[PDB]
Amino acid sequence: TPHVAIIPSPGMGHLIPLVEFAKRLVHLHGLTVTFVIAGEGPPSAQRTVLDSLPSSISSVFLPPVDLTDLSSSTRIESRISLTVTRSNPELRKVFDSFVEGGRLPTALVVDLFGTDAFDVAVEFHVPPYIFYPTTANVLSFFLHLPKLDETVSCEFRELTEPLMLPGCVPVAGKDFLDPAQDRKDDAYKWLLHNTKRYKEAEGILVNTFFELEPNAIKALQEPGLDKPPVYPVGPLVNIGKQEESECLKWLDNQPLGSVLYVSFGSGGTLTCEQLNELALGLADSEQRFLWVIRSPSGIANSSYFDSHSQTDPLTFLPPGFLERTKKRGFVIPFWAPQAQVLAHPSTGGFLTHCGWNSTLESVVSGIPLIAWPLYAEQKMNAVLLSEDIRAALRPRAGDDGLVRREEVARVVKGLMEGEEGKGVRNKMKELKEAACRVLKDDGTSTKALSLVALKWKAHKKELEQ
Numbered sequence: 001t002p003h004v005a006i007i008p009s010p011g012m013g014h015l016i017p018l019v020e021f022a023k024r025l026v027h028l029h030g031l032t033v034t035f036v037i038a039g040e041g042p043p044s045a046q047r048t049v050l051d052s053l054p055s056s057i058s059s060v061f062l063p064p065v066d067l068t069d070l071s072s073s074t075r076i077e078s079r080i081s082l083t084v085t086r087s088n089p090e091l092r093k094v095f096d097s098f099v100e101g102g103r104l105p106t107a108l109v110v111d112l113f114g115t116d117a118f119d120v121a122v123e124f125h126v127p128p129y130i131f132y133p134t135t136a137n138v139l140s141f142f143l144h145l146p147k148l149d150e151t152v153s154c155e156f157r158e159l160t161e162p163l164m165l166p167g168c169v170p171v172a173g174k175d176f177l178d179p180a181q182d183r184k185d186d187a188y189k190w191l192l193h194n195t196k197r198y199k200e201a202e203g204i205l206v207n208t209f210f211e212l213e214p215n216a217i218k219a220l221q222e223p224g225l226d227k228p229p230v231y232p233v234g235p236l237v238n239i240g241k242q243e244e245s246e247c248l249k250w251l252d253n254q255p256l257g258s259v260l261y262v263s264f265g266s267g268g269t270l271t272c273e274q275l276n277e278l279a280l281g282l283a284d285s286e287q288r289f290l291w292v293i294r295s296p297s298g299i300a301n302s303s304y305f306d307s308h309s310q311t312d313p314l315t316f317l318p319p320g321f322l323e324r325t326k327k328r329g330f331v332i333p334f335w336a337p338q339a340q341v342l343a344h345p346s347t348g349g350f351l352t353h354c355g356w357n358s359t360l361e362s363v364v365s366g367i368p369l370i371a372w373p374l375y376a377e378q379k380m381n382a383v384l385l386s387e388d389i390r391a392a393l394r395p396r397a398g399d400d401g402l403v404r405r406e407e408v409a410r411v412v413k414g415l416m417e418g419e420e421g422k423g424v425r426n427k428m429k430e431l432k433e434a435a436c437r438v439l440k441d442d443g444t445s446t447k448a449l450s451l452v453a454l455k456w457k458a459h460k461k462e463l464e465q
């Protein structure tokens, strides 16, 4: 059977969907999968995700890459991209051992920043594929970026008209994903470099689905200059049926649909001032909430690589906040069993950083959103979710960028109980239905993944014969 090697670039938001993808490949398509894990140190969260997999899935952990030459100011996308790039020598060794074992992969699947691993795929005559863990809208942006880079000579924030790619929500230059915001920085150089390599992929599998981004998917699937086949295969998520304990026990004690979940992904934190206003506004709202909290930082993605929290986040909360909210709020530091929370009947809303896994998980459970983007492509996702899909409400930030407690309370109440939240709640109901539809045996996302697996089985067949 085809053996598929999956090489994630660092990030829980890459590993998680890739694990869901691997499980589908083994359980639904009878393939074997090996994760080849590049990084700087042992896995953290990561082990919980890689644990308990079918034996048709193995993991190889490469020697840690030397990124000691990088300045502490290095942007995450540089670090993420270079972790895969500098790992190529160790990846070659792993491929040699696959060859010796009679298990040369039928495909090498990288994620959105891992395209330099294509060098190893090409060297071993293994078809390269990209598993793209965020939206068809942002994928369109990535595929266009080589052209945009060529045709536009200002920093993107200076553009006076929004970018409006076929089928895509318009996005202002100033809202393009974080690594696009400073074209002199290595983060842009690595972003650009990756995007230039997308045309080398034999296929791009994208974690989204037709009803969610119909216009962008249609556009992506139209023949184009140097454009690879694009396969929507989502929503590939943890549906939250696995057996942290205390916060779920708390949740069990709350009324149906009553709890606002609040979480900023695996790597997001707020400034001090924003943490303070959010706490105060959550309390003001008088809504029930379950907040996964991290210590504040001036850098929104400062926790991206962190295995744990050195400081106690609770020490940053305002006077009396924990007292006032003792019954109606549950504050959990650093990590929650999010898939379980979003699938829980007592959950009714999600204040999200708009990371795409969090978004998909929320869609699959019909949970409406407040869109609170922080970094990476989250602002692009927030524009898509609020202006096009219309499944998120957005808080108003002041001219200093601060969302004040009054706005927090207003939007929370709007989502949980108010008229403004009925539109988004209804839209999420429709998307929840659609999420089921597309993953049925003859659902569009299932069809797309099946086409890829079939291509891999055929390739293996031809090679071995």
Ligand SMILES: O=c1ccn([C@@H]2O[C@H](COP(=O)(O)OP(=O)(O)O)[C@@H](O)[C@H]2O)c(=O)[nH]1
Pocket (backbone or CB within 6 Å): 011, 012, 013, 014, 016, 263, 264, 265, 266, 267, 268, 292, 334, 335, 336, 337, 338, 339, 354, 355, 356, 357, 358, 359, 361
């Ligand atoms: O406390 C948390 C925070 C995050 N997650 C999971 O981590 C992933 C976060 O990925 P996402 O794309 O939403 O954002 P990222 O972490 O990449 O910014 C999602 O699967 C979440 O369910 C979790 O289990 N517990």
